[PDB]
Design a binder for this molecule. Sequence first.
Ligand SMILES: Nc1ncnc2c1ncn2[C@@H]1O[C@@H]2COP(=O)(O)O[C@H]3[C@@H](O)[C@H](n4cnc5c(N)ncnc54)O[C@@H]3COP(=O)(O)O[C@H]2[C@H]1O
Ligand SMILES: Nc1ncnc2c1ncn2[C@@H]1O[C@@H]2COP(=O)(O)O[C@H]3[C@@H](O)[C@H](n4cnc5c(N)ncnc54)O[C@@H]3COP(=O)(O)O[C@H]2[C@H]1O
Ligand SMILES: Nc1ncnc2c1ncn2[C@@H]1O[C@@H]2COP(=O)(O)O[C@H]3[C@@H](O)[C@H](n4cnc5c(N)ncnc54)O[C@@H]3COP(=O)(O)O[C@H]2[C@H]1O
Ligand code: NI
Lengths: 116, 116, 116
Amino acid sequence: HHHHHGSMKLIVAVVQDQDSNRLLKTLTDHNFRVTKLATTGGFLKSGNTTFMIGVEDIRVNKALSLIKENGQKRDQMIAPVSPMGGNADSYVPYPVEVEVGGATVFVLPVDEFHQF
Amino acid sequence: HHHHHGSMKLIVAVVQDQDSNRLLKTLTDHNFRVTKLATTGGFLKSGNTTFMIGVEDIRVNKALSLIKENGQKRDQMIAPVSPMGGNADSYVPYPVEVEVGGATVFVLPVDEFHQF
Amino acid sequence: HHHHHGSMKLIVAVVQDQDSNRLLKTLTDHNFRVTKLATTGGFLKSGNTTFMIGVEDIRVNKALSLIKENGQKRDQMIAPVSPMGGNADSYVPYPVEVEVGGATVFVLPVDEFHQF
Ligand SMILES: Nc1ncnc2c1ncn2[C@@H]1O[C@@H]2COP(=O)(O)O[C@H]3[C@@H](O)[C@H](n4cnc5c(N)ncnc54)O[C@@H]3COP(=O)(O)O[C@H]2[C@H]1O
Ligand SMILES: Nc1ncnc2c1ncn2[C@@H]1O[C@@H]2COP(=O)(O)O[C@H]3[C@@H](O)[C@H](n4cnc5c(N)ncnc54)O[C@@H]3COP(=O)(O)O[C@H]2[C@H]1O
Ligand SMILES: Nc1ncnc2c1ncn2[C@@H]1O[C@@H]2COP(=O)(O)O[C@H]3[C@@H](O)[C@H](n4cnc5c(N)ncnc54)O[C@@H]3COP(=O)(O)O[C@H]2[C@H]1O
Ligand code: NI
């Protein structure tokens, strides 16, 4: 049998808080419609921002190019086991550092789009 | 080659806070299952509510009709540049007004649905 | 006409807060990448946790098996009408109890995946 999807895509982009306001302004200035979700990174257990951007298929590439050009790689660290916290500040000799990328982006197919 | 999707759909509906409790009650009263996300509108930079509703394909239209009948258009304004806020109250001669719709809704295909 | 989707899937898993930290540790220990959303159950009107896990199709089953083995069924109750709250504590003779499952999981197709 046979199926298709609609003309809209749903972009889900996880970005760093430090890059969020910058991205949001660029997107809405370019007439993109955005919903923002306050999220937490699973590895760093720290706040980040997820943007949900429903876009016509013909504008997906422009949205992606704005997201790509917006962000910056940053180094962050995993928070040590915190029962003693007043010394964990003092510690970590070999910080578990990770590089956080500008954006992790999913472009999802959409069966139906409605504005009610 | 050939693929299909499952019988479930994932409805993602962005609604106004003022209409949220009303919608939620209607949905769960009609045996729909709902997860609520506290979100922010990208343009107004204000709180709104996103409902995630996983629905059998055969009940999608009923869910959509409840969402459609629930909401109301409302006017809102963009908050002016706030460094001086004590006068921004005083200002805005030509308020940038927008009309917020009852619901923006995405119906997503789902490859697998599991209840563990 | 003809379409396909990409090799990535987006897993959306709604779990209980009591099982969240346990699941997160297991997932990231197994090299899965996770974004966490603080959500609310529509029926219980209480906090729960939604994990968004973008996974290569070839690792989906492993992710699902970790999610499945992680959770536990728990009983919860619907909060009574609260205008008098100081007696609603006193009340509810026939508590509306529900069984909350370990995880409700959607595996979504993904058209494009980008790391910028
Ligand atoms: N299990 C693991 N083992 C070793 N290293 C790990 C790891 N999980 C994450 N990392 C590393 O830690 C950085 C921050 O991850 P976090 O989970 O806090 O924050 C993530 C998460 O919120 C989200 N993310 C990335 N990939 C994802 C995916 N496939 N599915 C869901 N969320 C993803 O984007 C944020 C930034 O990710 P990015 O890859 O740029 O950067 C990641 C990566 O460098
Ligand atoms: N395609 C999409 N993808 C993701 N989320 C979507 C979306 N379309 C709508 N939304 C979400 O629904 C809320 C209401 O959108 P609506 O289009 O009814 O009402 C909008 C519309 O009248 C206007 N608007 C939004 N973005 C605009 C823009 N970039 N330029 C001009 N007007 C915009 O401002 C109102 C409030 O927008 P806000 O962003 O605060 O809040 C939006 C946003 O959270
Ligand atoms: N199809 C779906 N789409 C979106 N989210 C879904 C979903 N199925 C489950 N969920 C999410 O998973 C949580 C646990 O659902 P579960 O079905 O295990 O456990 C449920 C179920 O036993 C019952 N329940 C939920 N909605 C009901 C309803 N409308 N009528 C009767 N019972 C309901 O109450 C328990 C807690 O529900 P709550 O809404 O607080 O919390 C739900 C909701 O956040
Ligand atoms: Ni398809």
